[PDB]
Amino acid sequence: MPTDDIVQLLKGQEEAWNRGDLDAYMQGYWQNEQLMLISNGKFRNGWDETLAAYKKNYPDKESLGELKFTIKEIKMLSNYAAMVVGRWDLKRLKDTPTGVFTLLVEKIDDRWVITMDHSSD
Amino acid sequence: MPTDDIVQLLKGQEEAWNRGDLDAYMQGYWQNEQLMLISNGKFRNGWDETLAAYKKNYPDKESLGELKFTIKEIKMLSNYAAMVVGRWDLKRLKDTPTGVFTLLVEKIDDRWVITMDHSSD
Ligand SMILES: [Cl-]
Ligand SMILES: [Cl-]
């Protein structure tokens, strides 16, 4: 079932993040210059650029912190596209940042990948 | 063409907002308890609840300010669903708030309506 595959995609990302593997984490995202990440106030695009940004921001794997997603809803839009709405939580040394996310996931090459990710706090 | 209808939906909302007509503005959104609006950090649902919230926040039509959307991308996902990514701008008496939005629009009853709206700044 697609919802199960979509759930596993996000579970895999939590697990990769939580073992400090940015390369594995990035496998949840569409590997394309069109990949669109939206933050609180800005747009950025591209998978290479996004991977580079995480490496820049987290030179030490211990700095990633512990990630958990709480999925509020998965809505199938077609056999090839779904929207995923949830909260994210990070447990850090001196804080516990929280926020929300909304994702478009699409079936590309028989795999579900995140093609647009709007995360805010 | 659906992209033209989606563009017009957002143009109609600008126009309604800019003449102080919240009821007309709300016609851009799916009229359902499932309507999902995501802000920087929180979820809210429902069309009635959203209309009530705008009326609460903007008791005076002059307080709405001038709204403009700048659409960055419309992506058709199927004949029934599209994602819309853009910036919003408001011109107010003493400031000019800006931010980003990502929307799911869906063809429901042969009309394009916003069913999920994640707006942040
Ligand atoms: Cl389909
Ligand atoms: Cl279709």
Side-chain angles (χ1 to χ4, degrees), chain A residues 78, chain B residues 77-80:
Chain A
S78 68
Chain B
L77 303 171
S78 68
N79 286 320
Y80 313 96

Side-chain angles (χ1 to χ4, degrees), chain A residues 36 38-41 43 72 75 77 81 83 85-87 100 102 104 106 115-116 118 120-121, chain B residues 36 38-41 43 72 75 77 81 83 85-87 100 102 104 106 115-116 118 120-121:
Chain A
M36 231 317 139
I38 311 92
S39 63
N40 271 70
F43 300 99
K72 179 182 181 49
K75 186 182 182 169
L77 303 171
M83 289 288 323
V85 180
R87 294 192 68 83
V100 295
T102 60
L104 174 58
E106 301 186 66
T115 63
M116 193 221 84
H118 186 175
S120 59
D121 49 60
Chain B
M36 231 317 139
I38 311 92
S39 63
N40 271 70
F43 300 99
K72 179 182 181 49
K75 186 182 182 169
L77 303 171
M83 289 288 323
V85 180
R87 294 192 68 83
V100 295
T102 60
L104 174 58
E106 301 186 66
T115 63
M116 193 221 84
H118 186 175
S120 59
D121 49 60

